């Protein structure tokens, strides 16, 4: 009766986004694992780019603009601009709330 350890994953958030974009559509376990790995890889890429951006400018804080510059560097064009728009909108809403 040894309970397995807690393994964190983005499965629930990916499922919520899928239900937002496709209500009557499911996802298999392998596809969910692939999406989780994609999220982890993109997270690592953007975080590393922001970290080296901060190091280059001799800054000790990763801020919104560092993440924005990382997104602009790593994403191909229209994806980058739409991601920047979504990020700025989310940050503005969060700041407006509290």
């Amino acid at each position: 009766k040894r309970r397995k350890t807690r393994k964190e994953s983005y499965a629930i958030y990916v499922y919520k986004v899928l239900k937002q974009v496709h209500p009557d559509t499911g996802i298999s376990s392998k596809a969910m694992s692939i999406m989780n790995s994609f999220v982890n890889d993109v997270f690592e890429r953007i975080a590393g780019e922001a970290s080296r951006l901060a190091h280059y400018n001799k800054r000790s804080t990763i801020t919104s603009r560092e993440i924005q510059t990382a997104v602009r560097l790593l994403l191909p064009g229209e994806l980058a601009k739409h991601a920047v728009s979504e990020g700025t909108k989310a940050v503005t809403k969060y700041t407006s709330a509290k």
């Binding site: 937002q20 974009v21 209500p23 229209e78 994806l79 739409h82």
Partner: peptide, 8 residues
């Protein structure tokens, strides 16, 4: 319920 402007 969600649509992206990239695909128009």
């Amino acid at each position: 319920s969600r649509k992206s402007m990239r695909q128009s």
